[PDB]
Design a protein around this ligand. Sequence first.
Ligand SMILES: Cc1cc2nc3c(=O)[nH]c(=O)nc-3n(C[C@H](O)[C@H](O)[C@H](O)COP(=O)(O)O)c2cc1C
Ligand code: SF4
Lengths: 71, 429
Amino acid sequence: TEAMIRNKPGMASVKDMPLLQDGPPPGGFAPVRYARRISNTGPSAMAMFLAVSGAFAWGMYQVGQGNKIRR
Amino acid sequence: THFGGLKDEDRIFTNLYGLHDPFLKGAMKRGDWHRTKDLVLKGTDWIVNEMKKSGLRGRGGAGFPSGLKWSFMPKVSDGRPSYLVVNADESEPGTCKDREIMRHDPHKLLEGCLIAGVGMRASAAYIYIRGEYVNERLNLEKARREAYAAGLLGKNACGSGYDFEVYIHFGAGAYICGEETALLESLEGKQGKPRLKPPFPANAGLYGCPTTVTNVETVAVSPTILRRGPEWFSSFGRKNNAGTKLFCISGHVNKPCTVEEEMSIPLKELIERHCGGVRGGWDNLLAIIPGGSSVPLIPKNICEDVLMDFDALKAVQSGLGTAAVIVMDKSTDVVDAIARLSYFYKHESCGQCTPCREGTGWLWMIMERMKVGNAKLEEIDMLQEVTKQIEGHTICALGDAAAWPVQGLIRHFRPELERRIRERAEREL
Ligand SMILES: Cc1cc2nc3c(=O)[nH]c(=O)nc-3n(C[C@H](O)[C@H](O)[C@H](O)COP(=O)(O)O)c2cc1C
Ligand code: SF4
């Protein structure tokens, strides 16, 4: 058998049997990423302290002015 | 030397074509039963010795050296009456050389029964006529009744002191029953199924009694071998192979005929001289099955200079069986012819052993596919391997006789098989 299970009309020979099974497409798949691409594009060490310090510098002045208005 | 030329005074089987009377008053004129009393009186050892010296080989497919075969029979009789079964039955495809001895000079066959019987210490001869040879065994029973009435056979061998009687058995249409170890059984009354060789017929054959199975042509040339010269007989053919085989040019020759002619004859010479010629000239030849049907093909490129003797045809990757040369010309479908041969071996295979019983139906199926082209280019190597699985393993040589036609067809005409397969492939799609 095995030439009556995989017919492929013609083929003249036991080789050239159909042989259609699963696999990667011709040319493989896309290059798959595996590294750790963690983007560190956030606020830096400064700009976070200076936003906090800047908020403290101006916002506490605003607390003071609000205390003046309340008084 | 250069063989082939056999003069009409050297042909052993005179009245082959039945032109003259076959029976007595017509056989004594041809030298039959001439002085067999002296021969029987010359003894058994002298007969065996002259048969061995004459180098007579088996006229049947086996090709065994006769005489040496007759020396296998026991000398001192231990109560088992040594028999002598004559293998009249042929049934080989192509072979009619037996059919021209059973009729048309059967008295040579009866005198050979007697001379081989005294030769191998026998006590009775069972001429196993092929079943279909009804007219032939009727002629032979007529000649047997004659040789009984003429005191030749029975209770005194031609007036001598030898008690020897010839009984005529006849099978019924079975090529397998013709085999040496199956003749004994098909004559013992059982089915025509061969027995294994470890008990040899010379040791325990017919009825368990010793016996030797001889083709009619070997037993029938025995008389004239002894009455003429064993040196004269061995003066024909090549060194080892010697004698005058009775050929049967079977098919696709413009004048098919069975004609006795010296062995070691060039196959081309035989064809061109006696049977006329390959239909449409020698250049029209396609293949030739030189022996019976139990022998591979000859593809016409090694058939020009091949000699019809056992040794050369065996050296050409073939065999000289009953020398029933089957000729096939460029007009035949050689694969269909070998497919019908394999069908024959499927039909006439007593089925006793598995390698032949099954693999021969298998060979027939694969051949009836490849003759259309329904196979695959690698099956031609399965077919070779299937045949080599059948060949050495079967009980008798019928396994051989069924693997050899297909093996020869492959070995020689593999281009034609592959061409049919590729043409089937291109016919699809
Ligand atoms: C495959 C096969 C085919 C045979 N064909 C024949 C045959 O056609 N004629 C015959 O007389 N004996 C035939 N025999 C029997 C023996 O092979 C052999 O021919 C016979 O027993 C003795 O013949 P011989 O004394 O000339 O060798 C055949 C045997 C086998 C195994
Ligand atoms: S199967 Fe073949 S070899 Fe075996 S006994 Fe039958 S014919 Fe002979």
